[PDB]
Amino acid sequence: DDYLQHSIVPTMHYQDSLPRLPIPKLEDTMKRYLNAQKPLLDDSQFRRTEALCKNFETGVGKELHAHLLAQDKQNKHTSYISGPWFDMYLTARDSIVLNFNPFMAFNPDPKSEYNDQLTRATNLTVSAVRFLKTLQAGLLEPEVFHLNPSKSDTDAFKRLIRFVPPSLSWYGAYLVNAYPLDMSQYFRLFNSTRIPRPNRDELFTDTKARHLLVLRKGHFYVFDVLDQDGNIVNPLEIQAHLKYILSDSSPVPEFPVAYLTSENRDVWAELRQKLIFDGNEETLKKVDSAVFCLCLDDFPMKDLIHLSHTMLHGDGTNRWFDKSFNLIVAEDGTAAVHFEHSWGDGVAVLRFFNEVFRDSTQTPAITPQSQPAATNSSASVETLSFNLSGALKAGITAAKEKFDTTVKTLSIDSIQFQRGGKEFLKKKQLSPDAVAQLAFQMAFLRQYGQTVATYESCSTAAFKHGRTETIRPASIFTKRCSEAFVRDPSKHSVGELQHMMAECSKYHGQLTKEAAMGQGFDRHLYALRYLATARGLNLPELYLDPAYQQMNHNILSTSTLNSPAVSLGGFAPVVPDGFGIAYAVHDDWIGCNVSSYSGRNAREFLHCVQKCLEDIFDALEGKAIKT
Numbered sequence: 001d002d003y004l005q006h007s008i009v010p011t012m013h014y015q016d017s018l019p020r021l022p023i024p025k026l027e028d029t030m031k032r033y034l035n036a037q038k039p040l041l042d043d044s045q046f047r048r049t050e051a052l053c054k055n056f057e058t059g060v061g062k063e064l065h066a067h068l069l070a071q072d073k074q075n076k077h078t079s080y081i082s083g084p085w086f087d088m089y090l091t092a093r094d095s096i097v098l099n100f101n102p103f104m105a106f107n108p109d110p111k112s113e114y115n116d117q118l119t120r121a122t123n124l125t126v127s128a129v130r131f132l133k134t135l136q137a138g139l140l141e142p143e144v145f146h147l148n149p150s151k152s153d154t155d156a157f158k159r160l161i162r163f164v165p166p167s168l169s170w171y172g173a174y175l176v177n178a179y180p181l182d183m184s185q186y187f188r189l190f191n192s193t194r195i196p197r198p199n200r201d202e203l204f205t206d207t208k209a210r211h212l213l214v215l216r217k218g219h220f221y222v223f224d225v226l227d228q229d230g231n232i233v234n235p236l237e238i239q240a241h242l243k244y245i246l247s248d249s250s251p252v253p254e255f256p257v258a259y260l261t262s263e264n265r266d267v268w269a270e271l272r273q274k275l276i277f278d279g280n281e282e283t284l285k286k287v288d289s290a291v292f293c294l295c296l297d298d299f300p301m302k303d304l305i306h307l308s309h310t311m312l313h314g315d316g317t318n319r320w321f322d323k324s325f326n327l328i329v330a331e332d333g334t335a336a337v338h339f340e341h342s343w344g345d346g347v348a349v350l351r352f353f354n355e356v357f358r359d360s361t362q363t364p365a366i367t368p369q370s371q372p373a374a375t376n377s378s379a380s381v382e383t384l385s386f387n388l389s390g391a392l393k394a395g396i397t398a399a400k401e402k403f404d405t406t407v408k409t410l411s412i413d414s415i416q417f418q419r420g421g422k423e424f425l426k427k428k429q430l431s432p433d434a435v436a437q438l439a440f441q442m443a444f445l446r447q448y449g450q451t452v453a454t455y456e457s458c459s460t461a462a463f464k465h466g467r468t469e470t471i472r473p474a475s476i477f478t479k480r481c482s483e484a485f486v487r488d489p490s491k492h493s494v495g496e497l498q499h500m501m502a503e504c505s506k507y508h509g510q511l512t513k514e515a516a517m518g519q520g521f522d523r524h525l526y527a528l529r530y531l532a533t534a535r536g537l538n539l540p541e542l543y544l545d546p547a548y549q550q551m552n553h554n555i556l557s558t559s560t561l562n563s564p565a566v567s568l569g570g571f572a573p574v575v576p577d578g579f580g581i582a583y584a585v586h587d588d589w590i591g592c593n594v595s596s597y598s599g600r601n602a603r604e605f606l607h608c609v610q611k612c613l614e615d616i617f618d619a620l621e622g623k624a625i626k627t
């Protein structure tokens with residue numbers, strides 16, 4: 001059939017009974033805020049911040065918190081953070097390229113010949129539409145984090161829990177140490193896009209649409225991937241239509257419209273209004289409502305750096321950046337997903353990514369020897385055309401200028417550290433995640449001499465409409481440990497260094513568990529600030545403190561995930577003087593993909609990260625420190 005999964009348990013089965021996202025006590029939030037400030041501030045700075053926190057906790061902060069609790073009690077169907085968080089990204093006026101949109105790249109098909117461009121674009125597209133159908137039919141297995149898979153992730157459990165009424169089902173999972181996740185964002189994977197509007201953008205979805213959008217050399221094509229009965233179009237016909245598009249010989253347009261999706265949102269909002277005034281509403285609606293955007297690039301990947309640049313931003317002509325996601329397939333079959341950040345936290349993208357990789361490689365729709373259907377693709381594929389005024393052509397030229405200058409300032413580098421990974425670190429009783437984070441702190445101290453604001457994302461999707469919470473990896477323990485390794489490397493014994501790493505690991509574990517349970521401080525303080533500003537209050541003094549600004553100017557911005565489908569991921573720094581650090585600790589090795597703008601150097605930072613990991617592993621093995 002048209003489904004890539006046949007879940008015994010309905011996809012949304014746990015959604016009605018997910019626990020409510022907790023709001024921390026204000027006293028706990030202020031202590032945690034101060035703990036994270038300790039390694040960042042000097043003594044006088046810290047004293048001033050401590051005084052502000054005291055005043056906040058007994059003054060306006062106590063009143064904002066009371067209002068927050070009352071609001072949350074009235075809005076028990078949702079979380080306190082979800083709305084304010086969407087609002088933050090949709091109101092932001094900055095370009096979504098680099099600033100917000102990340103990418104994940106697929107591993108190749110292990111069967112070499114299946115990485116032909118036409119073959120792979122066909123197989124990935126068909127698997128993606130099979131995912132759409134599976135999700136819509138409620139046949140996708142619910143998202144569930146298992147602590148004890150042998151007891152919870154079985155057919156016996158599934159056949160039972162399906163009969164448990166939706167209002168009790170979460171408790172059933174809880175009893176076997178399994179934690180169902182929120183899935184309310186998943187629908188925006190398909191038929192969805194971000195529409196630029198003055199002041200605040202909007203998210204648009206049309207679940208009726210049946211066509212795919214394809215971009216090639218800056219030209220837009222659409223054709224049906226679902227038929228009038230809602231069944232997936234014959235994969236050999238999809239192959240024919242993609243062959244037709246690949247055979248187009250038209251050169252890149254003089255004014256490629258895709259450039260506009262990279263603009264400042266107020267600029268793009270106005271230009272889109274001009275496009276509609278000039279009669280392009282029907283064409284825009286076809287772009288907005290397509291199942292997703294498939295991008296066929298007409299060059300192969302030279303190496304991992306070229307790959308990262310291509311998938312993170314490309315050349316500006318061949319991505320519709322507003323779309324929920326862009327599925328990109330290069331001439332050598334290299335494939336990735338570039339996605340718009342505002343519509344969700346990315347867990348849906350990872351689930352999509354994983355199922356599509358599995359389905360397209362284990363049960364591919366077509367083979368490299370498959371002959372395309374005998375169809376008349378000129379009748380079934382529409383080539384879109386935009387009526388462009390003189391004002392629009394000038395806008396596209398201006399958009400291209402801004403895009404080209406910015407993109408040129410970005411550098412990217414990667415490393416594959418093959419000395420060891422999770423297996424070794426676990427034998428040493430350390431958290432592998434804590435060890436990676438320690439290495440970044442150590443590298444920054446060694447190369448730049450500072451301890452700086454550091455961000456690590458953590459999911460709060462165990463809760464109803466849960467989102468993310470910030471783990472703050474820069475602690476008094478990592479600062480102490482980094483200084484031990486770096487300032488005078490021969491100073492401490494290996495036993496002392498092992499003890500210090502064990503402290504970092506223990507504390508990082510505590511912060512991780514707290515964050516996953518909604519007990520970080522960042523979202524709580526953000527929600528109080530949002531409540532103040534929404535009610536037109538003067539910003540409380542806590543938020544005017546340079547320390548607060550510094551804590552939210554994340555020089556080290558990091559993210560990780562674990563998946564056999566993902567070759568690497570990437571994202572640009574979130575501040576001009578920052579790094580964007582994507583990493584993964586595998587069983588036997590560690591990978592990092594780091595971006596920087598002109599003010600820093602990603603490759604040089606990874607020289608240092610490599611040195612720091614060698615140091616850490618040496619000490620763990622009981623070897624004397626060496627250069």
Ligand SMILES: O=C([C@H]1CCCCN1C(=O)COc1ccccc1)N1CCc2ccccc2C1
Pocket residue numbers: 145181345346347433457458459460461462468512516559560561
């Ligand atoms: O594995 C984790 C944590 C801790 C290790 C770093 C990555 N984690 C993340 O949450 C990553 O979260 C994001 C979210 C959005 C974008 C990037 C990364 N948990 C944390 C809690 C939790 C909750 C539900 C299901 C599994 C886990 C395991």
